[PDB]
């Protein structure tokens, strides 16, 4: 509360560390469904159904332009990519399985880097 603060966690490397994790996600072989925005002109249903589209390139732009106020807002966008994936794709599909793999891969990097 006012004048009552927990000890200060050093947040000065977070920007760089998030950037590294995003690079590791981008180079994973199952990243291909997620690298660029879904094409809203060419994928019927996606615009109407997915209210908040998100992808790795869009995450990169936001990060590199100071649009994440903290590391949790970054994690939320990453998870949104996989939540969107799950909404639109059958679990029993290549893209569905890609999303599951990538989510797990991310959550490990995240825990190991910060928790």
Curated annotation (Swiss-Prot):
It comes from the Eukaryota. Expressed at varying levels in several tissues, whereas a smaller transcript was expressed specifically in testis. It is found in: Nucleus. Residues 9-113 form the Bromo domain. Component of the BRF-1 ISWI chromatin remodeling complex, at least composed of SMARCA1 and BAZ2B, which regulates the spacing of histone octamers on the DNA template to facilitate access to DNA. Within the BRF-1 ISWI chromatin remodeling complex interacts with SMARCA1; the interaction is direct. Component of the BRF-5 ISWI chromatin remodeling complex, at least composed of SMARCA5/SNF2H and BAZ2B, which regulates the spacing of histone octamers on the DNA template to facilitate access to DNA. Regulatory subunit of the ATP-dependent BRF-1 and BRF-5 ISWI chromatin remodeling complexes, which form ordered nucleosome arrays on chromatin and facilitate access to DNA during DNA-templated processes such as DNA replication, transcription, and repair. Both complexes regulate the spacing of nucleosomes along the chromatin and have the ability to slide mononucleosomes to the center of a DNA template. The BRF-1 ISWI chromatin remodeling complex has a lower ATP hydrolysis rate than the BRF-5 ISWI chromatin remodeling complex. Belongs to the WAL family. This is Bromodomain adjacent to zinc finger domain protein 2B.
């Amino acid at each position: 509360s006012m004048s009552v603060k927990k000890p200060k966690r050093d947040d000065s490397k977070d920007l760089a560390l998030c950037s590294m994790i995003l690079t590791e996600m981008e180079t994973h072989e199952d990243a291909w469904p997620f690298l660029l925005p879904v094409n809203l002109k060419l994928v019927p249903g996606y615009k109407k159904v997915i209210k908040k589209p998100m992808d790795f390139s869009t995450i990169r732009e936001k990060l590199s332009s100071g649009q994440y106020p903290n590391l949790e807002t970054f994690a939320l966008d990453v998870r949104l990519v996989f939540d969107n994936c799950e909404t639109f794709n059958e679990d029993d599909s290549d893209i569905g399985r890609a999303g599951h793999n990538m989510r797990k891969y991310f959550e490990k990097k995240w825990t190991d880097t910060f928790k």
